[PDB]
């Protein structure tokens, strides 16, 4: 028996935050179901699943071992991403292994040429859960027999067409997308298991409209052309006076996400989604994290710029960030503790967990330098009145 | 409302680059707010309530002066309004049930106002935003045409037909005679007010020849009509191997094929921006003349060049799904003009049938040059699907 670094964290009062009382709204759905459906009705205005909730732990197990019954290909997608639909009518999104565990993105790669890797999708779910955001839909890693579980169970002529046997006698496939869907970029098992991330599926858009927002620090997905925030140091004085960003719980929720993204090095956060039925006053669904954890010896400061320009965070997430730096807690050991509960262990190589620590204290220094320029209270909003003390 | 569902889909939430001091061409009047909103990439915005309100001005603003556009194929009038902004007026030359005869050449075809209107909505549904706004309008040809002109050459052509109806024909070339007059029943004619682009004094326009321009003569075929490898060389000639230009011609040539408009002999740009802007899809009046015939000659630019934008390809596929699809989305927005029905039902169904031919021309072309070689990617950094 061993002591859990993760057990100490979830006992701490900064992780015993209670939500407001939920009315008839704030629920998305009126109301022994499958675990994927119990996850859907558990979605409310503030979070995506809530703390603990043994459904999420058991829903991650369903993604691991439920029989894959049908597979289809998201046509016209960003890169190759598959849709797995299971025996219990719930489905999931599948991103296969594109890069090895030791690899880093080349330095000369643009953010829009980067590979999407299953390690980030998985690890982002755990990192977000450890920061008590609870905004990433649950995702479990899975080894898939790419013959019986991908090719032989699809009636999609375009995904089936790309399966071949390489001169190495391995089974390969690549589908038909835009980035890295060619014979020279095929995905080959050794010889017939490929590995990938099964991301639980958010409720069908028929019964849960989702507003898609532009985020104001969206990069100029062009070379030789900088974006507005890249030239104007007072860019956020103007964004906090623009509609949806002067009323929340919104600039502060973007500061949560933009600290999330910096910790992983994910600079491809050009949009964020909301649940619409709740309005301009709900949380940000942290989706599409596939671009993180590509570089571990490099910290991308561009992502933090929203924080240096806007200069305000939530108090809840500020003290947790400070707690995630204390040696008795701290991202690194708190992350491989959870990340060991996936089948794909190690889902993050040891230098990437080490990079979480270094990037974290850069966030604390950007807040300390920024709290030492606008003063407290102007920088740190207070969402802890009526919450466990410290 | 099927049109409500379309503009919620992410393929219609494309965002622009940040606009610099350039990329801009420049309680105002609505036509002037339309001018200053013209930028490098588009001509308006997906509301932008100015555009919708500019069509109401074209419908019901008081006509203050009318002039005659000299030397045209047919009659076109210049209506200038109470607020000094003007528009181009094309009167009704064809009824709704008529089709262009089969023995007609593309260069003998009439311009009909219903096509000018429907082309604007079709273009807005393809998220192009390249056609100047146009609204349909019934004009009392006494109070709003004859009695408010100081061009005696236009006023002189008003007469009374043996049927006690009010007629006029103007003075152009070849279809401006007593036998081609436009007669109300008894004094309303109906026509299309096409909004006017900014004056060329303060907004120069370069006009380009397109390489698939037909040889506007009988017997003589054009260059691209004999060489199936015509575009192997056209993508190596100056202006067409740098854009966003070949890609913009494929946008325009898919636009034109959908309407059957085979009279696209030239296209204009705004110059102030250079070789790197959008193509203003102007004067689309030759489309929607035939609904029982799909003119494949228009598509040859697509089979020869074999490349589209991914932006417009995915929308083309979307406009084919039964939950969206051109037909119902077109009569919905064509129901918001005064001239209802501006498109007869067989013409809207042909919009669907012609679409599935374009989607077939790309799939046959995407499985022979492959993705990436055929479909350029401009959706990096745009909303996911």
Numbering used by the authors:
A (entry chain C): 131 to 161, 198 to 556
B (entry chain E): 134 to 159, 198 to 556
What did the article's authors report about this structure?
The human genome encodes three Fam20 paralogs: Fam20A, Fam20B, and Fam20C13. Remarkably, each has a distinct biochemical activity. Here, we use a combination of structural biology, biochemistry, and phylogenetics to elucidate the molecular functions and evolutionary relationships of the three Fam20 kinases.
There are 12 molecules of drFam20C in the crystal asymmetric unit, which organizes into six pairs of homodimers similar in overall structure to the Fam20A−Fam20C heterodimer. All the residues that participate in the drFam20C dimer interface are conserved in human Fam20C, including residues corresponding to Phe299C, Phe300C, Phe354C, Pro357C, Glu374C, and His375C (Phe275, Phe276, Phe330, Pro333, Glu350, and His351 in drFam20C), mutations of which reduce Fam20C activity. These analyses, together with the biochemical results described above, suggest that the human Fam20C protein probably forms a similar homodimer, and that dimer formation is critical for allosterically activating kinase activity. All Fam20C structures obtained so far are involved in a homodimer configuration or heterodimer with Fam20A, and likely reflect an active conformation.
